Amino acid sequence: QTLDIQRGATLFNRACIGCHDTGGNIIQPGATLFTKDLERNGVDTEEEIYRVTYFGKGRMPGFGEKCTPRGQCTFGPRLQDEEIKLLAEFVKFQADQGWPTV
Amino acid sequence: QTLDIQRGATLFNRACIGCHDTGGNIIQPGATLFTKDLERNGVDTEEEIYRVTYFGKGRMPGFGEKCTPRGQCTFGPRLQDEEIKLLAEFVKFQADQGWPTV
Amino acid sequence: QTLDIQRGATLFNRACIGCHDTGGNIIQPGATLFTKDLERNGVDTEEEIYRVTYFGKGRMPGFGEKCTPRGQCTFGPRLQDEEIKLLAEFVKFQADQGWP
Amino acid sequence: QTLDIQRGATLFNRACIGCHDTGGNIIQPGATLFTKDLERNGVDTEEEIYRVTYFGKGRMPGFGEKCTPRGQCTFGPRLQDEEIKLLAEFVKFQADQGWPTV
Numbered sequence A, B, D: 001q002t003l004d005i006q007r008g009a010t011l012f013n014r015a016c017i018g019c020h021d022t023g024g025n026i027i028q029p030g031a032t033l034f035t036k037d038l039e040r041n042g043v044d045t046e047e048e049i050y051r052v053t054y055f056g057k058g059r060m061p062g063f064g065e066k067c068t069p070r071g072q073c074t075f076g077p078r079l080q081d082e083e084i085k086l087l088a089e090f091v092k093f094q095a096d097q098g099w100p101t102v
Numbered sequence C: 001q002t003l004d005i006q007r008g009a010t011l012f013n014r015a016c017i018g019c020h021d022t023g024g025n026i027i028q029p030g031a032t033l034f035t036k037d038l039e040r041n042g043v044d045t046e047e048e049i050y051r052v053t054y055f056g057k058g059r060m061p062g063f064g065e066k067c068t069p070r071g072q073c074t075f076g077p078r079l080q081d082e083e084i085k086l087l088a089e090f091v092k093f094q095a096d097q098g099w100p
Ligand code: HEM
Pocket: A012, A015, A016, A017, A018, A019, A020, A025, A027, A028, A030, A031, A032, A033, A034, A037, A038, A039, A041, A042, A043, A049, A052, A053, A057, A058, A059, A060, A061, A063, A087, A088, A091
């Protein structure tokens, strides 16, 4: 694996596995991180995955510095842009590969 | 495919295709960009792939800004650090995947 | 100056100076790279500057690899994502500075 | 303000502000982040700022993931290469500009 994927996995385990363990979605059926769901929901481009991660979507909190208002955003520390870039890259790679173990 | 692999492919097709088209090595045997040869030669980490690309190695010219001496380095445009970073990522990932078309 | 500014300037002097010398606009009045024009045209943020540079806007050619269609895009080589990032950074910096 | 300076400010306010608030230096005289001191100490290029941040210097710990030896490096969380790049950019810019606000 590459350094970017390794870092992506580390960030994912820190920030995302509460709701998306093994690529799933414990809150919203049909909105997993697998390719078919990403496509159905219009979040299949890496750019859109970044946007969803930064700003949030529906009941998902955004993680970006400038996510707003605070109720739409993570209770925890905001992630840096580069971290969100790596997370979007990780989700795109994982979806392309059918979610190999992280 | 991720954006990073697309970006790396663009760079690879410009800078590396002279000797390493399709992951091979036209100059000498046993030094392709396939896993077995990277492992054989001890150039199997992104850090080392970066180093070889930056500074050169034997009959391979270096592409880094501070590649020296001149004789060991490309006489074309030198690549930026981020470009070589992308190239190291590209080679590592492509080696892992057995060099599929991008 | 920083490495990013230096690289941004190098890229600008190759790809942009023809139409935007000293932050101006040789084709379109009211659409210079100065702060007030950028704001008036809704190209206020660095993210929007990147979008415009990548995809183009009318007689402004797009420089990104996926700019489309061809007639909307530079006739020269497409610029890399990182290059367009540096260009948006350069233009934002220069606009903030008032193009000295 | 550019995105990069904002990203650098965020990192600075987490890792550096405790000793270098306002571009100063609380530990010892004559080693602030102002141009005059950077030039005097030979830490005036962006590359040298990066190196000092990564590896440390005198009483300053290094923050790089691969900083050595152990005693010259932070015992707290280490920074990623991209974070140190943004920090070096931030310091170089702020020094060039005479440490204006934000
Ligand atoms: C961790 C930083 C994190 C990432 C990365 C992430 C990504 C992500 C994507 C790409 C989607 C779109 C899925 C689709 O099929 O359309 C998505 C959607 C939802 N998420 Fe998420 N998500 C991360 C973090 C979290 C956390 C910690 C939670 C739980 C609190 C969470 C929840 C959700 C929910 C709900 C959705 C569905 C949104 C909708 O379309 O209604 N996410 N996430």
